A and B are shown apart, each in its own frame.
With several copies, the nearest count.
Chain A
Amino acid sequence: PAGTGYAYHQDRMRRR
């Protein structure tokens, strides 16, 4: 949840 995966974790944290 830092690099390229920060967009993925934004998406997963938004979709809860």
Chain B
Amino acid sequence: RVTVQDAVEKIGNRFDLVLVAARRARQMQVGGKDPLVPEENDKTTVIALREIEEGLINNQILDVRERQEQQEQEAAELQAVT
């Protein structure tokens, strides 16, 4: 990793890049989620920006996945209750 130019080419604000990559790295580090790109024993920050460069992560997809994996948890709870 040297430059983050295409990670700004795909998220034009350059400040939303930091929020999206921090949200992604916090999901990968403590929450225990797998990286969507195969790593090379990089740290979670570079893996976050490496997922940004592929395009498969931004704030839209992160909100989609948090709503679907919150509805999945509450659906599992409701089907366990009733």
Contact = CB atoms under 8 A, between A and B. Distances in A.
Nearest to B15: A4
Q: Is the interface of B mostly helix, strand, loop or mixed?
A: helix
Contacts of A6: 15
Contacts of A7: 15-16, 19
A3 interface: yes
Interface in A1-16: 3-4, 6-7
Contacts of B19: 4, 7
Contacts of B18: 4
Interface of B: 15-16, 18-19
Interface of A: 3-4, 6-7
